C-alpha cells in the first residue's frame, strides 16, 4: 500500500461515516501571534478592497477627483470626524505595513522563536499606533 | 482533601446516534500523580472505564497521548494538572481531526503524509551499504540537533490553521520538519529531488508563518523555523 | 463466528511486534522479498524501544583498539553462565555489521573528531578479556538512541511492501499439529477479528515489567507474546530472571539511564559515602546491574537510605562539566527535571531499583527458531520464531549487560529474517487452516467483553502488581516466595470473577487492558513459581536461603578431582515453565545451557568462574 | 520539472520590498512615474495576496476556477482604473496629498 493510496483510503473511510470532527476554533487558546496573523489578512483584504474601489470608481463613476473632494468637503465635515475617517484609513495600512516587514524578516529566518515573536508582535502594535496617530495628524 | 473538576470530551461510536458531549469527573489530587494522564488513568481505573485514550510511555517520549488540554496541544503525560482548584480542566482530542472514539483521533493521514516524504537515507551508490560506517563530522551532525527528536505526536501539525483547512494537501509542520531533517543530512544524496517534490501551491506553501506549531511543540522543537529554512533552500537550489 | 465478523489474510510472514526487533525482522523479511505482514498493537514508533536512552554495543573500535571477542567474554561473564555462548558469539560478532547497517540506514549517531560513530563506557565492559580496564564500545545517538534506532528502522521499512496492521491486538497463535500458521488478532479500530496466516510467524512482543508495581517499562509492556506461547502449550525459559535497573525515579518509576554512570556520574547514599566502592572495589558504580541494585537495596534495609521516609538512594550528575549534560544527557536533563523538579546540573537525582528488563521469554535458537522440550532435548517448532525482550535465546542469561538489548533487537531481528530467507522461498505454499481455527481466542474475547463479575480489571491487576512486588523483588526467600505463589495462584482463579464495563466494538481500552491482564498473570505465574523452585543465587535472582552459585562443579576450587554433579542436582540450567490454561497450574522442567560457541578456533568457550565485579 | 512554486513565492517577496520601497519614495518624490509603479506594485501585490486567501479557503476545482478568474478581472480592472486616474486625473500621489490637507 503506497502513501497516495493510504491517503485516498483515509478520505473515503472517514467522509462516509458517522465520525464527528473534533472542535478547533471553538476550543483553541488565542495567542497573540494567531490574532496578529488574522489581522494581517483582514487588513490586507480591506486594503485591497479600498484600492480596487479607488480603481473601479475611477472608471465606472463620473466627475474628477476635485469634483469628488468638493462633494466630500461640503458635508459640513467635523474636524475630529475627519481625523476618525483619516486614522481609520492609516491604521490598517500601518499595522499591515509594519507586520509586513516582520514577515519578510521571518522569510529570511531571523526572529523565529516564541520570545522574539512576542517581542516583535508588541513592537509592531506600538509602531502601528505611533505611525497611525502620527500620520492621521500630518 | 482537594477535589478537582475535569471536563472531558466524549463520544461513543457504538452508542447509536450519540453525539459529542462533555463529561465531568472529580479527582482527589492527594490520591493522584502530578500529570494529567495520571488523572486520566485514575478516572479510567477507579470511575468510568469507558473513557478511552491512547497512552504508553508516560515519559513524554513516545507521542501516544497527545491531546488538547485547556485549549493547547500537549502530551498529557508531561503537562501537570492545574492545582488551582477554581479552574476546571478541559480535555479535548486533537483539533480538526476525525474522532474514532472519545479522545482518539484518526492519524492515518498524518502517517500517510509522513510516509510520502520518504523519511530515510537515500544514497546514489547503495552497492556499498551495510559494510562501512559513513563519515559525518561533528559539525555536520550538529545540523540534525533539534530536528531528529521529533516524536510525531502530531501536536504541531494539528495546531496549524492551514492544516486545519488544507491538511489533505498541506503536509503540515510535523512532516515538513522531517523532510528538512533529511534535506540537511550530509549523508543523503537526494536533497534537490526532495525539494522538487514540494513545488506546488499546497505541500509546503500553505505555511503562512502563523507559528502555532513551534508554540505548541511539547518537546521544545521549532518546526516553523524549519519550514522557513526549506523555503529559503527552495528559492535558491539550481537545477 | 456469526456475531464477530472474521477476515482472513494470507502472507509469507507475520511479525507480531514493531519495536527494534519487530521492525528489523519485518523489514528484513520484506527486503529479502517476502510478502510480509507486521501486526502491532501500537503505532511502531510508540513501541517501547523509543524510551531506550543509553546505547547499542558493538566492538567497532572507534574509541580504542577493540575486539568483539572481548565483548563476547563480557556478555557471557554478565550472563552468570546461564548465557548460551553460541548465541553470545553470534551476537557480539555480528554487532559491528549490525550497527554499521543502522548508521547506513540514516541513524544519526553522535560523532567523533574522526567523523565516526561515537562510543562510550557502560556497565561492566572490559578490554583484553577482563584485564584491560574499562572499555568504550557503546554506540549512541546522544541520550535518545532508542528513539533514533526505532525511527530510522520504521522509516526504512516504508521503503518496502511491509503490510502494517497498526493497532491490531494479537490474541493467539494459529498452531496446527505442532506447527505455526500465523496469528489471530483483534483490530482495535472496528472491533472485528482477523486471521493473518503465514508460513512463518515471528514473535517480538517485548517484556512484561507491568506484572510489577514499580517498573520502568511502558503501560504496553504486558507479556502478550510470552502469553500466546504459553497458551499454545509451549515453554517459557527463565521467567524468574527479572532485572531491577538500579536508577529508576522514586515516584513515577521512570528510568535515568546507566549512561549517567558511564559518563563519570556517581551513586551517593545518605551518609556522604560513594557506597558503590565498598561493595565492588574493582568496577565501582559502573559495575553489573544485578550487583548495583542489590547494593542500593541492601543499603536501604540498614537505613543508609535517604529522602523523606528513608527508602531511596541518590544518583549524582552535578559535578561533570555542565557542558557534558547538554550533549550526552539531554533526555534525562529534561525528564529528571519534569518528574522530580530537579536541576540535574546542580542537584543529584532521587533514584531506586525498579523492574526494567526481562532476560526470560520464549526459548530460542541462535537462529531465532523457537524451541520446545521433547524427551529432554530441543526441538524446533516449525514456522515459529521470536526475538527481543519477548524472546530468550538467553544471550543475557541471569543478568543482561547494559546496552546489549538494543543490540539483541537488531541482531536477532535480522537473524529471524535470515533464517526464513535461507530455509524457504516467498510464494511457498501457505499451509491450510481449520475453519474452526481461532474459535477459542474469540470466545474468550467475548466473555471478557460482557463480564458482569464482582472484581474490576484495574483492582485485580493492582493486587498482582503489589504481590509480585512484595514477593518477587530484588531479595527473596522460600517463605516469602511460596506465600506469593499461592497468593498469585488465588488471583489467577479470581480472573473468573472480573468486571469490565465498556461493552463496545470500537477502541475498547477496557476489553484489551483486561486481555492484557490475562497475559500478565501467565507471565507472573511462571515468574514467581520458577523463582521459588530455583534454590540458588545467580544473576538477578538472589536467594537469602541459598546465597550460593550452584554449578555442575564448585568452580572456585580448581576443576580436576571434583565429582561432577548430575543434571538434577545443580541449578546451572534453564528453567522451562508451562501453565495449565484452565487451572493456573504451573508445571516446570529444565534444559541445559549451551557452552560450545559457534567455533572454538574463532571464539573460545569461557568456562564458569567466580563472579566478582 | 519547473520550479514554479518557489519562483512565485520569491516574486511575492520581491514586489513586497519594492512596494515597501515606494511608500517612502512617493512621499519624497511624487510624480507621474511613482504614480504608475505605485499602481503596478499595489495591484500586483494585492492580486497575489488574495490569490493566497483564495487558494486557502476556496475548496474544489469548481469554485477555485471562478474565484481565480473573477479575481484576475478585478485586478486588471483595478490596474486600468488606477492608470486611468494617473493619466486623465490628479494621480495617486497628488490625490492622496490633496485628500490629506482637508
Ligand atoms: C527506560 C528504558 C531504557 C532502556 N534503555 C536501554 C538502552 O539504553 N540500551 C539497551 O540496550 N536497552 C535498553 N532498554 C531495554 C530495551 O530497550 C528493550 O528490551 C527493547 O526496547 C525491546 O524491544 P522489542 O522490540 O523486543 O520490544 P518493544 O520495543 O517493547 O516492542 C514491542 C512491540 O510489540 C508490540 N505488541 C505487544 N503486544 C502486542 C499484541 N498483543 N499484538 C500486537 N503487537 C503487540 C508492540 O506494539 C510493539 O510494537 C531500556 C528499557 C527501558 C524501559
Ligand atoms: C509596504 C507595504 C506592504 C508590505 C511590506 C506588505 C507585505 C506583505 C507580506 C509580506 C504579505 C505576505 C505575508 C504572508 O502571508 O506570508 C502580505 C500579504 C498581503 N498584503 Fe501586503 N504589504 C504591504 C502593503 C499592502 C497593501 C497596500 C495592500 C492592499 C492595498 C496589501 C495587501 C495584501 C494582501 C491582500 C495580502 C494577502 C493577505 C494574506 O495572505 O493573508 N498589502 N503583505
Ligand atoms: C481560534 C482562532 C484564533 O484561530 C483561527 C480561526 C480561524 C482562522 C484562523 N486563521 C486563518 O485562517 C489564517 C490567517 C492568516 C493566514 C492564513 C490563515 C489560514 F492558513 F488560511 F488558515 C485562525
Ligand atoms: S514537532 Fe514537536 S510537536 Fe510537531 S510532532 Fe515532532 S514533537 Fe510533536
Ligand atoms: S502553525 Fe501552521 S502555518 Fe506555518 S509555521 Fe506553523 S505551520
Ligand atoms: S504517553 Fe508516551 S508521550 Fe505521553
Residue numbers in the entry:
A (entry chain C): 6 to 143
B (entry chain B): 9 to 247
C (entry chain A): 10 to 622
D (entry chain D): 35 to 136
Excerpt from the publication:
Flutolanil (N-[3-(isopropyloxy)phenyl]-2-(trifluoromethyl)benzamide), a commercially available fungicide, is made up of two aromatic trifluoromethylbenzene and isopropoxybenzene rings that are connected by a peptide bond linker. This compound is a potent inhibitor for A. suum QFR (IC50 = 0.058 μM) but poorly inhibits porcine SQR (IC50 = 45.9 μM). To obtain insight into its high specificity and potency against A. suum QFR, the X-ray structures of A. suum QFR and porcine SQR in complex with flutolanil were determined at approximately 2.9 and 3.0 Å resolution, respectively. The determined structures indicate that in each enzyme, flutolanil is bound to the quinone binding site via hydrogen bonds with three conserved residues (A. suum QFR: Trp 197B, Arg 76C, Tyr 107D; porcine SQR: Trp 173B, Arg 46C, Tyr 91D), and there are 13 residues within a distance of 4.0 Å from the bound flutolanil, most of which are conserved in the amino acid sequences of both enzymes. In the porcine SQR-flutolanil complex, like A. suum QFR, the trifluoromethylbenzene ring is surrounded by a similar set of residues (Pro 169B, Ser 170B, Trp 173B, His 216B, Ser 42C, Arg 46C, Asp 90D, Tyr 91D) and the η1-nitrogen atom of the guanidino group of Arg 46C donates a hydrogen bond to the trifluoromethyl substituent with a distance of 3.2 Å. However IC50 values of the derivatives 1 and 2 are comparable with that of flutolanil. This is probably due to the unfavorable arrangement of the guanidino group and the benzene ring for the electrostatic interaction. In fact they poorly overlap with each other and are separated by more than 3.7 Å.
